[PDB]
Amino acid sequence: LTALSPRRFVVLLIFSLYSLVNAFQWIQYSIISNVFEGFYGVTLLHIDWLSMVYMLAYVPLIFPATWLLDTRGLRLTALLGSGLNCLGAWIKCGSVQQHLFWVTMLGQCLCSVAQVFILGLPSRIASVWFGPKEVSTACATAVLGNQLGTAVGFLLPPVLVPNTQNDTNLLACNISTMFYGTSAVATLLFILTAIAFKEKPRYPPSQAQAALQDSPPEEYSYKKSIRNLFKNIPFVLLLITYGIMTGAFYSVSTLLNQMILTYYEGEEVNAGRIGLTLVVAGMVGSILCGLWLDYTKTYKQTTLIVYILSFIGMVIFTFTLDLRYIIIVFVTGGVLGFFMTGYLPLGFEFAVEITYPESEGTSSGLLNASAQIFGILFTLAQGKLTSDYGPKAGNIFLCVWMFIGIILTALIKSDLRR
Ligand SMILES: C[N+](C)(C)CCO
Numbered sequence: 001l002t003a004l005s006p007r008r009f010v011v012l013l014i015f016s017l018y019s020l021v022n023a024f025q026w027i028q029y030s031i032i033s034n035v036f037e038g039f040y041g042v043t044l045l046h047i048d049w050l051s052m053v054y055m056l057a058y059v060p061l062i063f064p065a066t067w068l069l070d071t072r073g074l075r076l077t078a079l080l081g082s083g084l085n086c087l088g089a090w091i092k093c094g095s096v097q098q099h100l101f102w103v104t105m106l107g108q109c110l111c112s113v114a115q116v117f118i119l120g121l122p123s124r125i126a127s128v129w130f131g132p133k134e135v136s137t138a139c140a141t142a143v144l145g146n147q148l149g150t151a152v153g154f155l156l157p158p159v160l161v162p163n164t165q166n167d168t169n170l171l172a173c174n175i176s177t178m179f180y181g182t183s184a185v186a187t188l189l190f191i192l193t194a195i196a197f198k199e200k201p202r203y204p205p206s207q208a209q210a211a212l213q214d215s216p217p218e219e220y221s222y223k224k225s226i227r228n229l230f231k232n233i234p235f236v237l238l239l240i241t242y243g244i245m246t247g248a249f250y251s252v253s254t255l256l257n258q259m260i261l262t263y264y265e266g267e268e269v270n271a272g273r274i275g276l277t278l279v280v281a282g283m284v285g286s287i288l289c290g291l292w293l294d295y296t297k298t299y300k301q302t303t304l305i306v307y308i309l310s311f312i313g314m315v316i317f318t319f320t321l322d323l324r325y326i327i328i329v330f331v332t333g334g335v336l337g338f339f340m341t342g343y344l345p346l347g348f349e350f351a352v353e354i355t356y357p358e359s360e361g362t363s364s365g366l367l368n369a370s371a372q373i374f375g376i377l378f379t380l381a382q383g384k385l386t387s388d389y390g391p392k393a394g395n396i397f398l399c400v401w402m403f404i405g406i407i408l409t410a411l412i413k414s415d416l417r418r
Pocket residue numbers: 022023026054055146150250372
């Protein structure tokens with residue numbers, strides 16, 4: 001007996017809203033990094049770690065959290081993710097004093113742990129609550145909610161918190177409004193989850209879901225699955241290429257304020273708009289994807305073309321940032337974002353034919369973890385190069401790693417159409 005309950009929209013809306021808030025808090029410091037660097041009296045490296053703790057916490061916690069989801073259930077993961085997102089936000093509101101950077105780092109740490117319960121959720125929520133014809137749309141909608149949070153996180157902080165470095169009293173007042181506004185919204189979404197989020201529908205939405213309930217998986221042996229995946233040569237290549245592409249996006253997002261403010265001083269508002277253009281353009285590219293994969297093309301071909309076009313965009317972005325024209329940075333950011341962040345759902349869909357029998361949870365956990373590892377390596381390396389030699393040295397570093405990703409992409413032997 002398959003039935004569709006009106007609660008699926010409520011569940012999807014609630015998750016996509018507090019998944020939006022989680023991605024908002026990840027980047028809310030980096031887009032105004034020069035504001036927090038002077039307010040907290042720390043170096044730029046301290047602020048970049050407010051964005052890197054999201055990546056660092058994901059790698060060692062993803063698989064224990066995945067085990068929790070498969071054993072306890074969907075509701076507990078939703079409560080923990082939205083609950084920790086709210087709890088971390090309230091800690092940040094208590095750190096609006098100049099000598100309380102470690103308090104906002106502690107609050108950022110709690111938000112980072114919340115993401116482990118959020119980033120892989122869209123696939124589970126879509127399958128559990130939506131029918132066969134709506135699974136892809138529901139999963140894509142929840143995933144895009146995380147990207148929308150990053151786009152909002154680029155735009156709002158430059159508007160909410162102007163760089164009034166000379167008057168620190170108003171600087172603390174503006175930061176309180178952002179932190180209090182975030183925690184108020186995070187608390188509201190936590191309360192809604194505790195009321196409306198449910199373990200499962202009264203009836204299975206899809207025939208596959210009905211069989212899944214009739215076949216309790218019990219254990220899964222992640223260690224067996226993770227070691228069966230590292231013997232798949234195309235998947236190992238896909239793990240590296242996906243991490244490089246997403247890691248470059250993470251590093252560019254973290255250091256976007258540093259590059260723009262190097263040339264265009266006092267351009268925090270436009271820097272926030274540039275990041276919004278990058279993320280929004282790639283959101284459209286994700287929606288347009290699928291139309292890219294025509295009935296003659298394969299996932300491997302589409303991945304190779306997008307990877308090449310993303311690398312070209314990175315080169316064009318690298319050598320146009322020094323031209324002292326903020327307008328072309330908007331155009332180059334949109335072109336770069338259209339391919340760099342529009343690749344994110346493409347890499348996940350390519351890991352379906354490569355990894356057919358093994359559960360999507362392990363492959364998703366590995367692909368996401370690879371992005372976190374590369375994002376840390378890229379942010380640390382590009383940040384070091386930018387702080388010593390300028391934005392061009394850091395941006396050139398990403399292009400070389402993007403070229404390596406092209407070579408590894410072409411070496412994958414896997415042909416299967418849409
Ligand atoms: C997924 N985010 C882009 C929000 C951060 C990962 O570290």
